[PDB]
Structures are given as C-alpha cells and as structure tokens.
C-alpha cells in the first residue's frame, strides 16, 4: 500500500493532499486547504501501518499540518487520523482535530473536530 | 519554543514522548505507550507552529504514531492535536484520535477519541 | 424549525431517528440503529435551539440514546451533536460520541467518535 | 446507580450540573456553565444505562444542553458522552461536542470537542 497511498488526493472541500509513503511507514508531502485561514501549500508529515492485515481491512494512518508557511501563520495545527481503502474507488477516510493556540483559560475552546474523505478524483 | 518543546514528556497514563523540534516546524521522535497493544518505542513525526503569538497563547502542534515496530503491529495509528504551554509547569495539552484498520462496513467503529496531558515530570 | 425537525430521519447507515421537537426546545423520540449491538427502538431525548438566527445558519441541536431497551443492553450511550439545515434537501449534520461502560483503567478506550448525516429520504 | 447519579456535580471549569436519574434511564436537570456565552441555568436532558454490568465498569450516559434560556441565546448545543464511576471519589468522566449554528459552507468550523470531569465536591 505504499504504492496505493502515494500520490494526490482531494477532499469534499476541494483541498489537495500530495503525499509520498516511504517503505517503513513515513508519510511526507504538502497540503493545500480550500477552506479556512490558509494560502498556498503547507508541509505535512505523518505515519501509516506499512504492513496492514489482508482481510479487506483498511490501512491505518495519520498526518499533521501546522498552518504556517511563507504567506500565512494561522497559529494552529490539524491532525487527520484515518484509513486508506484501496481498489477502483480508493478512499482515505478521516477524522480530524484542529487545535488553535489559545490562553490556558480559553483551552476549552481550542479544538475543532470534523471529518474529511479523500479521493483520487475532483 | 523549539527549546521548550524539545525533550521528554510524560502523560497521565505513564506514556513517554521524546521529541526534537526543528527550527522550521518539524517534530521527530519516539513514543512509548504505557497502555494498549504497544511494546517498546514507536516512531513519531509531526509539526508545530514555529512562530506562536506572544499574548500568552500556547503553541499549536500535532504528531502521529503508527503502531508498528519490530515487536508489534497493532494495525492502527494515533494522532495527537494540541498545544504547548511553557513556564514552570510546562504542559502539552492534547486531544487524540486513534483509528484502527477496519472493513468499510465497520468504518463507524474505527476511531477512538480521548485526551492526554503531557508534563516534563513523572 | 419545530416543524422542520419533527418527523422521521435516516442516516447513511440505514438508521431511523423519529423525533418530535417541542416549542421550548425539547426533542423526544425513538432511534433504531442499522449498525452495532442494537435491536428494535431505543428512547432518545435531546434539545435544540428553538430560536435560530435567520442568516442561513443551521439550528444547533443534540440528543442522546442509551443502548438499553427490552431486547438488549449494550452498556453504552451515544450522543449526536449537530445542526438542522432546512429546505428542499433538508439535513441534520452530526458528529457523535459513543461511550461504553469500562473499568477506570480502560477509560482511554471507552469512547468512539464518528459522524452521521440525516436526510428525510431512504 | 439511579441513587449514585442523582444530585449536583461540578466540573474543572466550575460549571454545575444538577440532575435526576429516573428509574428507566432518564436524565433531567439543569446546567450552569462557568465558561463561554452562558448565563444562569439551562435545561438538560439525557439518558443513562439503568442496568450497568457489575464487573467494576462505569455506567454509560449522556446529555444535551441547548444554550438558550431567558437571558441568552448562544445558537449552539453541547452534548456530553461519558460514564459514571461510583465510590468514595465518584466521578462522571466525559467527552463533549459543542456545535454552533453555521452556514452550510462554514460547516467544517461548526463543532468544538473537549472533555470535562465531574465530581461531587468544589
């Protein structure tokens, strides 16, 4: 599934995730968000299970983007946790957490949760 | 906060997170879980906001561990999203998502959510 | 939106949510899950914002089901948090948390997170 | 555990949750938040597993508050999912989701996640 994961993915928001999966579990790449306080591409890094089971289960993975690049600093970071499912309609199904830098008093309002689905077309 | 983040952290479960923060936002390191289907150390990678605001807000960050190393393969990955708060009781406050590889039919039961707090002592 | 919310909704799993919205914010009804350790109907109760803004924003709401009825006891409860959006393709968009009764030591593995979308057809 | 749950609970934010647990799984009561856009008391309703297992596992429960009362309308609702653990340091351990009414375009930024722990003292 190194082969399966590596490439360009798109989510339902129009965001673009470009990733290379390394042989021993690394994910590296760039993320471009169609939504929020984001412009251009941001570095991403993450991990995947390089030896998934072969019972039709997906391949567990995750990655993080900190929302800082040369154009913008959104004082926040998102992590996506999910799985890759291969085949003719290959998908990466995720849930994510977006934490923004807040005072310790405003900690309760720091973290958004949502869900993105990534496909190889759009 | 490169300085502040780099080092060894412990959570309320007894887990140990060793991390180096790089100058332009990288987090690399190892994670050893006191809980779950985990043995020894696992690679982690993530990102942090290398230029946080200076109003007392924390520093947004996240990282991922895929639960595969030479000893075990738990067909799963966790991502932690949170923030570093510095000072005499420095903390990394997080929420996490743990996704396990599942059939597409069992997707609804794939992802656990929780929260860990990391400190420099314990 | 009392009118809009009251009725029968279906999610992407084939589950059926029957609800009455009361004038001062109550939600009462029954839930029948197509997934998991569930049979027949279960009581639900919840709340909604009975005076939403009129800028095209949805109507905030939530409800809980404890997974006990005469046929089954799954020692667990789900809560759905989300919003009702009206019109020709009316939707209730939700995120949910499912907590299962666990020992205090297994607390970290107690809570699943996911997302359901409800429609008036299927 | 009807007995155990019924009463007044306090969380780490100073919020106060007053609840009655009914014999067949109902939770009714009032919630007063020390945090956020909240004043005075708000209705809550929820459910609990009225027949938990007796292996030391907690009692699964959840409830919802819509943030509207005579004083304020915050166009939002929170749901808490968690468990009651009895004994000399009785606790209700929760994760919560707070959804705010948003346009369908801003749906991705609608829902906060966090965690509250409730105790019988403070």
UniProtKB/Swiss-Prot annotation, chains A, B, C, D:
Belongs to the avidin/streptavidin family. The biological function of streptavidin is not known. Forms a strong non-covalent specific complex with biotin (one molecule of biotin per subunit of streptavidin). The keyword Nucleus does not apply. A motif (Cell attachment site) lies at residues 47-49. Biotin binds at residues 31, 42, 80, 96, 108. It comes from Streptomyces avidinii. Keywords: Biotin, Secreted, Signal. Residues 2-122 form the Avidin-like domain. This is Streptavidin. The chain holds residues 38 to 158 of 183 of the full protein. GO terms for cellular component: extracellular region. It is found in: Secreted.
């Amino acid at each position: 599934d190194e082969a399966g994961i590596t490439g360009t993915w798109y989510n339902q928001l129009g965001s673009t995730f470009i990733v290379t999966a390394g042989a021993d579990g690394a994910l590296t790449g760039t993320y471009e968000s169609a939504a929020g306080k984001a412009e251009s591409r941001y570095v991403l890094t993450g991990r995947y299970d390089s030896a998934p089971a072969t019972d039709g289960s997906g391949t567990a993975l995750g990655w993080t983007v900190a929302w800082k690049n040369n154009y913008r600093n959104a004082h926040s970071a998102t992590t996506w946790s999910g799985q890759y499912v291969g085949g003719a309609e290959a998908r990466i199904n995720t849930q994510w957490l977006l934490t923004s830098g807040q005072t310790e008093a405003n900690g309760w309002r720091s973290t958004l949760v949502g869900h993105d689905t990534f496909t190889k077309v759009k």
